Amino acid sequence: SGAIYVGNYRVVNRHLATHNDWANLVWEDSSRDLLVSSTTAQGCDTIARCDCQTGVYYCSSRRKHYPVSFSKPSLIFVEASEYYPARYQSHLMLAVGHSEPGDCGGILRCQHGVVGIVSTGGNGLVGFADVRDLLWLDE
Numbered sequence: 814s815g816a817i818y819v820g821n822y823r824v825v826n827r828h829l830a831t832h833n834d835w836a837n838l839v840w841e842d843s844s845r846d847l848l849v850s851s852t853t854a855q856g857c858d859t860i861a862r863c864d865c866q867t868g869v870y871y872c873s874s875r876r877k878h879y880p881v882s883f884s885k886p887s888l889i890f891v892e893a894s895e896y897y898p899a900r901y902q903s904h905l906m907l908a909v910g911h912s913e914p915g916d917c918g919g920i921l922r923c924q925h926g927v928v929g930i931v932s933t934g935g936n937g938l939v940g941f942a943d944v945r946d947l948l949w950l951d952e
């Protein structure tokens with residue numbers, strides 16, 4: 814579990830979105846596993862606007878932060894799940910690192926701010942849904 818809070822927005826994994834998130838929907842994309850909903854309170858996360866390929870993520874299943882090198886956002890095949898059929902997930906970045914299903918929502922950050930959130934994993938890999946292209950999150 815986990816979310817990004819920036820301005821009047823809440824960014825979460827689309828497969829973990831709540832009834833409240835869907836009742837206050839701003840935008841959602843199944844191909845990215847992202848959903849953004851509106852909030853009454855003000856968010857203070859800084860979103861990174863960069864092409865960094867190194868950063869640090871939070872891994873809830875270990876209660877620890879890990880440094881990682883990660884790939885550029887791209888279309889990566891993801892096996893079928895209870896939430897989606899087998900498909901290519903777009904805007905996804907992979908890294909070598911520990912992850913378990915409950916790790917989704919953990920933030921990945923570089924020196925510039927929030928890069929994205931854990932969205933996939935398995936076999937010593939961890940996948941992050943990128944958020945750096947969503948320029949509208951700031952205004």
Ligand SMILES: NC(=O)[C@H]1CCCN(C(=O)Cc2cccc3occc23)C1
Nearest residue numbers: 846891894912913914917932933934935
């Ligand atoms: N974006 C998707 O389509 C997700 C939906 C839920 C399932 N999923 C996973 O990758 C499950 C998983 C296994 C093992 C380590 C994992 O770390 C994070 C997630 C995960 C794909």
Ligand SMILES: [Zn+2]
Nearest residue numbers: 863865923925
């Ligand atoms: Zn950066």
